[PDB]
């Protein structure tokens, strides 16, 4: 049982770059990657072979260039792959994988506004099995993946 | 069982770019991608081989150029492919895949208004099996996909 | 039972570089790495073969270039791999591994603003089993991983 909670938080604004170059190219079984470039993002990965939460209560976001990017990656993979990219302030990410519950809530928040760039370059090229990709560029996006075999 | 909920949220406005270049070109089994460029979008993917929710309660959207795009992608795929693109503020996305329930609700909201650009460049070129694409550019669009084999 | 807590803390601002060159290339069983470059980050690893907390109460962050990077690493691994990279001020990291609970909370905080660079160069190349990667560049990101076999 995992939990990730964020109560009140005052963000006031700046360069934010997050990326993955040629990497995770090959895989077997499960694989999960989450990339974000922001202020209060949340990331979580759960995988297994053979009950989680993510809360984001009141936060004051006030304001900058945000670059969340993913270059060559996850090209030739077998099994499960989950990729989530977001360039915002309060995004939430999650990946659930299995071989042979979930909840993501965002309560009251104050987003006020700045350039946000998401991205997915040459990637996910030859995926056998399962694969899920979520890309967003905003303020309060939410992403989740769920894959299984057997 | 997955869940994605967004209670009250005050969005006040800005550049938002989200895209996927030549990627996901080949696939086997299942594949799902969701791209959005906005404020409070929600993304979820569920796939398997061999009960989900998405709520969006009251949110105050007040206001910027939004660019949600997908260049070359998902060209030669075998099995299931689900792509959802939206350039708005409170869109919701979902992909359900299987080999061998669902609900998406949007309660009260306050959308007030700005350029929104969706897009689907050369993609989905040669898909064998199943494929579904949903493109929208707005404020509160909702997208969902459901594919299966066997 | 582990615990990592941070009460009030006044951070006022500077070069911060943290990286891992060609390393952790091979592995067996479990492996977990966390890299951060900031002010009040928290790191924790828990692995086993055959009840943890992480609190971050009020902290005043006021302000510098932050470089959190990971070059070649985690290439050919068997079993479980968990990598978390963050370039911020109050990020939190955790890795849970097993063969054959969790909570991460961030209470009130004061983030005020500067360049933040995350990164993942050629890595995770050929991972058999489980692997999870979380990359962020911000102020209050939170990362967690959970993998198991058997």
Author numbering:
A (entry chain B), B (entry chain C), C (entry chain A): 45 to 57, 60 to 96, 110 to 122, 125 to 161, 173 to 185, 198 to 234
How is this structure described in the published paper?
We reprocessed the data using a 14.4 Å (3 × 4.8 Å) helical rise and −6° twist, corresponding to a monomer with 3 layers of cross‐β structure. When we performed 3D helical reconstruction, we obtained density maps at 3.2 Å which show great overall similarity between the three layers but with differences in details. A model of this FapC fibril was constructed by fitting the density map of three layers with the AF3 model which contains three IRs of FapC residues 45–96, 110–161, and 173–234, while loop linkers and other flexible region of the protein cannot be modeled due to poor electron density. Residues 45–96, 110–161, and 173–234 comprise the FapC fibril core of layers 1–3, respectively, excluding disordered residues 58–59 of IR1, 123–124 of IR2, and 186–197 of IR3 which form part of the core but do not show sufficiently high electron density to be mapped on the structure. The Greek key‐shaped cross‐β structure is composed of five short β‐strands, each layer spiraling around the helical axis. The Greek key‐shaped structure is formed with strands β4 and β5 tilting out‐of‐plane relative to β1, β2, and β3 along the fibril axis. The staggered structure of FapC fibril allows a residue from repeat layer (i) to interact with the neighboring residues in layers (i + 1) and (i − 1) within the same β‐sheet, and with residues at the opposite β‐sheet in layer (i) and (i − 1) or (i) and (i + 1) to form hydrogen bonding interactions. In addition to the many hydrophobic interaction in the core, the FapC fibril structure is stabilized by an extensive network of hydrogen bonds. More strikingly, the five highly conserved Asn/Gln polar residues located inside the inner core engage in extensive side chain hydrogen‐bonding in the inner core of the Greek key arch. The cryo‐EM structure suggests that Asn and Gln residues maintain the shape of the Greek key arch in the FapC fibril, which may explain their high conservation in the predicted structures of FapC family.
